[PDB]
Design a protein around this ligand. Structure first.
Ligand code: ADP
Length: 96
DNA sequence: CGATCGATCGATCGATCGATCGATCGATCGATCGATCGATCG
């Protein structure tokens, strides 16, 4: 890990390795890459907290593999939970 | 060992408000037709 961490173009190797069999859409691939690594959460005592999670919205015309990206994120991420807008319910998301 | 209310969440129907659309009343300028007339030369 330390060896690759200091290699040339480490950020470009990461982004170009997001979804290898998807062409272009590099502004999404860089957005997918950043959402996987995430930020650093902060909690100031006696004040409110700050989230470190990165939120991505993929809006596009039919095609463009928006769904296949979420299928690639499901397998690569450590703990991935997949949901669908119509197949989910208010109880099925919050609690039972 | 059996009979009677209770709470929950999915599934279905339906009724109510709203998005969508064809129609008419009021208007008007684009296109045209004719009259007016000032200008030109035999
Ligand atoms: N930019 C792209 N490059 C390569 N293949 C693509 C691309 N966009 C779509 N595809 C092909 O289309 C399919 C994705 O379709 P789909 O997930 O239904 O897109 P969406 O859900 O965003 O409409 C994949 O199997 C993929 O092979």
């Amino acid at each position: 890990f330390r060896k690759i961490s200091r290699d040339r173009g480490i950020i470009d190797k990461i982004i170009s390795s997001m979804a290898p069999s998807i062409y272009g859409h590099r502004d999404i691939k860089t957005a997918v890459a950043c959402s996987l690594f995430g930020g650093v959460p902060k909690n100031v005592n006696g004040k409110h907290s700050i989230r470190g999670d990165i939120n991505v919205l993929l809006l596009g015309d039919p095609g463009t593999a928006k769904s296949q990206i979420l299928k690639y994120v499901e397998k690569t991420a450590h703990r991935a939970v997949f949901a669908t807008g119509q197949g989910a319910s208010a109880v099925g998301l919050t609690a039972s």
